[PDB]
Design a protein around this ligand. Structure first.
Ligand SMILES: Nc1nc2ncccc2[nH]1
Length: 154
């Protein structure tokens, strides 16, 4: 019982792009860009499509960096999130009614205003490590338990 999602982190040498979501699941929190994968669409093509829909940016080179499964207690479907990273993009981040993008210096990533799992695996993403994670949430703020291990192959 799992549903495919994407998450794209535009990660440059000294800064990362994040978006403040206006409404929906995760509203009020900085996050990477992504969403559901469509029928007949590859996960990577879905990640590319969502990056543009939400941030206005066109990615060229995308790299798999992680897989994180999210469980919310009481909700049947697990979120199977395929995480990607890129440095080579085109365009300028676009603010829309749905999303407010902002660049952050790497020592100023706003973990307090992000999903609480991010502080666990971001240190790996910033050091170019690949990972497999699982986070069991109660509600949207409480991590009941988790696993996170590095991998050589996502
Ligand atoms: N970046 C990010 N973390 C998350 N945790 C739970 C649900 C969705 C999430 N998106």
């Amino acid at each position: 019982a799992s549903r495919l999602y994407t998450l794209v982190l535009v990660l440059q040498p000294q800064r990362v792009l994040l978006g403040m979501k206006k409404r929906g699941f995760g509203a009020g929190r900085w996050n990477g860009f992504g969403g559901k994968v469509q029928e007949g669409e590859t996960i990577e093509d879905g990640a590319r499509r969502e990056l543009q829909e939400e941030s206005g940016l066109t990615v060229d080179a995308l790299h798999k960096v992680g897989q994180i499964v999210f469980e919310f207690v009481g909700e049947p479907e697990l979120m199977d999130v395929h995480v990607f990273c890129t440095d080579s993009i085109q365009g300028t981040p676009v603010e829309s009614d749905e999303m407010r993008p902002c660049w952050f210096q790497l020592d100023q990533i706003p973990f307090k205003d992000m999903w609480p799992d991010n502080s666990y695996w971001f240190p790996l993403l910033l050091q170019k490590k690949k990972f497999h994670g699982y986070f069991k949430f109660q509600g949207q703020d409480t991590i009941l338990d988790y696993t996170l291990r590095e991998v050589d192959t996502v």
